[PDB]
Design a protein around this ligand. Structure first.
Ligand SMILES: Nc1ncnc2c1ncn2[C@@H]1O[C@H](COP(=O)(O)OP(=O)(O)O)[C@@H](O)[C@H]1O
Ligand SMILES: Nc1ncnc2c1ncn2[C@@H]1O[C@H](COP(=O)(O)OP(=O)(O)O)[C@@H](O)[C@H]1O
Ligand code: VO4
Ligand code: VO4
Lengths: 556, 556
């Protein structure tokens, strides 16, 4: 019975615009009161024709209440829709902020692209929840609450039947939820499997289309759809049974109310006006119960997605030290490792017992066979995740006591996978300095030879590359990344696989240019080619996370 | 007014299960006729008590009609829900089939990852459309069609009231659509821009989190949200105005009906039983017209997405010559290019004036500076997209006249980006021969040195890599790709960027192993390192898509 918890969370997210929310609630209670009082006035005026006199005023009051209901309906529709859109946008904003705030391991483990789909689905479901909940729930709940005393003061037999009617509705709701929850969980897990398979297949379309695996993959997805649709039937059957049972209850209560009114015809206190007002009350409750039953169904359907979204909301517990914490500045270059190892989750390997000191003014290149632990070493230095048990002494200062904002501000790491956005070359490069100049961009590009091939094609700089540079081949993304790194101008430059299958003349030119630019500071080289480290000062080779010699520039 | 075309296309997707759909329509029309007959019998039995006699039978008949209504409601709910889910799954299946059918360029230009989101959104919108449209619209349309003659045979005064009511509703609907379509289009375009920015930011979270660009990105997305909500208010304002106007129309018509019935009380033809039955008709029409107005609102909201989906469906005009087109066999290796050049859309560069012959039994290596056109040459050899003007002579046969199914069955191309699924290592490698055996898989893996570092970690071969192999580093994706290529065992091997920044010992071992495997066939080398072509027999160098010499293995 987590429905109440879900509704509390929804109201917590919706309790931001205090003024707008309070005005909406006031409008809802007023319109509910008007809708309840309208049949009472209708009964008044129907009984009015039995006597004789100037009883035209009650009809005027009824017309005024009708016009007031119209105006209130307009205002509540407008305000509810506006509030729903504003709060949906705000929730999306804050959720996106936390989502991009998340660390790298959490994204690589689960997120990829499923996180975006979950965010969008949860956001739209919450939008629908906010709108329909607000309107229907406030109106019908206030109507029922104001109806209880009126039914208490009027004939109590009909109220006695009506409370049993409400008991019937809540009982069938409980019954359906009990018979439906397990099937809902199974359906959700099957749908997640299906969506994951679809996303994984679409994201790798070239591989699947280059191996004649279309038939096999579509048959597997057909199997997944079969598995999902196996568990879909019982829950909808139960929903149909619930709809039929409540329809039978509504018709049964209507017949009972009609018979009671017929008995009241023989003798009673009030008139056919009260009788028909009671009938109108009954039919209004029938309709609103139908809408809230449908609403309960939609809420049950979206339950699992809302639960997952709330879990990801509360999963943001990585405290960032809001208080002013010690930063670093004027990084001349002093890097010390002290017996720092890492063990992967549910795995092993990694680095083991690594320690070395870095003096300013000289560069260090790390070489060695693949899988040794060089990339994880680099992303440990930049601290994408915290080491197991060790001290990263930078400028004689631990990496744990340094704020994240200043940690990566004075660092310059090209990635092994040079990822790029789909924006223009200007936007994709001009990220190391938001206040830079086009002359600076040209100089940075010409230092990395990423301009000589772009001035002579594709509208010069203003070219929209595709996703991950899928529109200008792939031999340019490395040049663009190294140009961006040179533009960043940081004291510590990290060349992680910046030297790859390119022209040997291009490689030597890039190496000499970055040598001339980084002679003023200390920089890191992660490459297996022995021709890109002729100017290195303290080179070391690492195997399987264990150093062997870590000797001088010239070693055997 | 593409609304009718949208309904026709949706129904055409729906009327596939002819038996089930026809039964659903028959059940709906029968239950609608029953619901229309109910007030008539109610008015009869209310009028029947005016006289005296054994007139208990009409009351029992009315109860039986209510029971039929209940049972038919259950039947239509269950059948409609089941058919809707089945149709949604089938539509998703076939749309996914066409989506993966598309070539690479169409995905690189527009799809990438937005296509999946569009497909999911369109599919769920179509599900909701099918369900709600079928039930509500069919019931209410049959209701109106059966109601018009009954009221025409009864007093025509209320009939003239009713037709003006309908005219008011349809005219306000047309005016609202005219005032709202432009706002809907602007909202859709802004939403698409917002989603594109969100996806581009999330997909490359490492770069944005390693460059302190979180604040700028979130502020830009806030600006996008502001721009989106600027055009968001007028449309909802117009819908609120329309809702108020139709509420006023409904109350006004109810007032008119009450006045007409009050005059009819003085004198008329039928009784208050028929009067109140017509009152029930009026309120039922009011409610159903309100629901269908809301449905029109949802259809307008989803109209742009449905239009995009239908345009994508109709864009699938890739005729594959359904008749048996001549395939290829006896593939010993005969590849000749004859003056085939390609021009990119709205660009230049590419290959120009290429002419060379391939003799079976020898390997040919393509070298040259980056951006020359080697990757595009390779993927035209595999015919990922159709060349501009020329012939690809394979085994003395043009590549156009061979079906794509068997065209790529005798090829083995490792991509520049080694794409991998998030399945196991065994499932990711065993894709060329599903009926193969573990002995073959082990031999292929140990031939490509993708076994020595996986036999002693993570449950051996049963290791679940993440997306793009983001869980076992990146020095293994190349090994897995080359192992899979060796496993495929095709006559023409293509080592496109199969050699990269790896250990020199590992590189030389891989080269000798692939040489020994491919001695019985022909293969290509796309690499800039000069150490991987010592065993080549016919080397040529291509620059800017223009050859210079294209000589033999030994050249100056
Ligand atoms: N996300 C991960 N989960 C588990 N193990 C990993 C992960 N990323 C890398 N590894 C392990 O770390 C080892 C070294 O990876 P890496 O440092 O990225 O490559 P290299 O050692 O060539 O620089 C690999 O053998 C791999 O198994
Ligand atoms: N999708 C594309 N759209 C436009 N131009 C492209 C596309 N892909 C590649 N090119 C152009 O083709 C040239 C050669 O690319 P490619 O063959 O992939 O690399 P290489 O020449 O090193 O093999 C590049 O300079 C690039 O500008
Ligand atoms: O620019 V390349 O396609 O030779 O990596
Ligand atoms: O296997 V590596 O991360 O040294 O390219």
């Amino acid at each position: 019975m987590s429905l109440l918890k879900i509704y509390w969370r929804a109201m917590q997210y919706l309790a931001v615009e205090r003024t707008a929310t309070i005005t909406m609630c006031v409008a809802s209670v007023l319109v509910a009161l008007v809708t309840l009082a309208e049949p009472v006035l209708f009964g008044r005026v129907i009984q009015s024709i039995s006597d004789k006199g100037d009883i035209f005023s009650p009809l005027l009051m009824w017309a005024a209440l009708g016009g007031f209901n119209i105006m209130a309906a307009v205002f509540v529709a407008r305000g509810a829709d506006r509030l729903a859109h504003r709060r949906r946008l705000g929730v999306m904003i804050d959720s996106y902020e936390r989502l991009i705030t998340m660390p790298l391991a959490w994204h690589q483990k689960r997120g990829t692209s499923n996180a975006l789909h979950t965010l969008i689905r949860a956001t739209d479901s919450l939008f629908t929840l906010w709108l329909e909940f607000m309107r229907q729930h406030l109106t019908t709940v206030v109507a029922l609450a104001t109806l209880i005393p009126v039914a208490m003061t009027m004939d109590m037999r009909m109220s006695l039947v009506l409370i049993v009617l409400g008991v019937i509705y809540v009982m069938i709701g409980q019954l359906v939820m009990r018979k439906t929850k397990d099937g809902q969980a199974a359906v959700e897990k099957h749908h997640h499997k299906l969506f994951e398979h679809v996303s994984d297949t679409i994201s790798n379309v070239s591989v699947v289309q280059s191996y004649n695996r279309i038939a096999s993959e579509t048959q597997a997805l057909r199997d997944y759809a079969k598995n999902l649709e196996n568990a879909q039937f019982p829950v909808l059957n139960w929903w149909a049974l619930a709809s039929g049972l409540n329809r039978m209850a509504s018709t049964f209560s209507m017949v009972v109310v009609l018979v009671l009114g017929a008995y009241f015809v023989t003798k009673g206190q009030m008139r056919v006006g009260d009788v028909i007002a009671f009938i109108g009350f009954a039919q209004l409750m029938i309709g609103r119960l139908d809408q809230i039953s449908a609403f309960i169904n939609q809420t049950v359907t979206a339950r699992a997605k809302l639960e997952e979204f709330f879990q990801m909301e509360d999963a943001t517990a990585d405290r960032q030290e809001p208080e002013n914490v010690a930063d670093l500045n004027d990084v001349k270059g002093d890097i010390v490792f002290d017996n720092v190892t890492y063990e992967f989750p549910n795995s092993g390997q990694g680095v083991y017992d690594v320690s070395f000191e870095v003096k300013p003014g000289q560069t260090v290149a790390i070489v060695g066979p693949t899988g040794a632990g060089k990339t994880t070493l680099i992303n440990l230095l930049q601290r994408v995740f915290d080491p197991a048990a060790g001290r990263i002494m930078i400028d004689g200062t631990d990496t744990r006591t340094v704020s994240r904002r200043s940690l990566r501000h004075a660092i310059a790491t090209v990635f092994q996978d040079a990822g790029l956005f789909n924006r223009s070359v200007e936007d994709n490069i001009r990220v190391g300095r938001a206040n830079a100049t086009h002359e600076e961009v040209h100089a940075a590009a010409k230092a990395a030879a990423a301009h000589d091939f772009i001035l002579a094609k594709s509208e010069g700089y203003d070219t929209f590359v595709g996703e991950r540079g899928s529109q200008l081949s792939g031999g340019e993304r490395q040049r663009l990344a190294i140009a961006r790194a040179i533009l960043k101008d940081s004291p510590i430059l990290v060349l992680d696989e910046a030297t790859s299958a390119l022209d040997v003349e291009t490689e030597e030119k890039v190496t000499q240019a970055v040598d001339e630019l980084s002679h003023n500071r200390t920089t890191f080289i992660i490459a297996h080619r022995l021709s890109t480290v002729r100017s290195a000062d303290l080179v070391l080779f690492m195997d399987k996370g264990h150093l062997v010699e870590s000797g001088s520039f010239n070693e055997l």
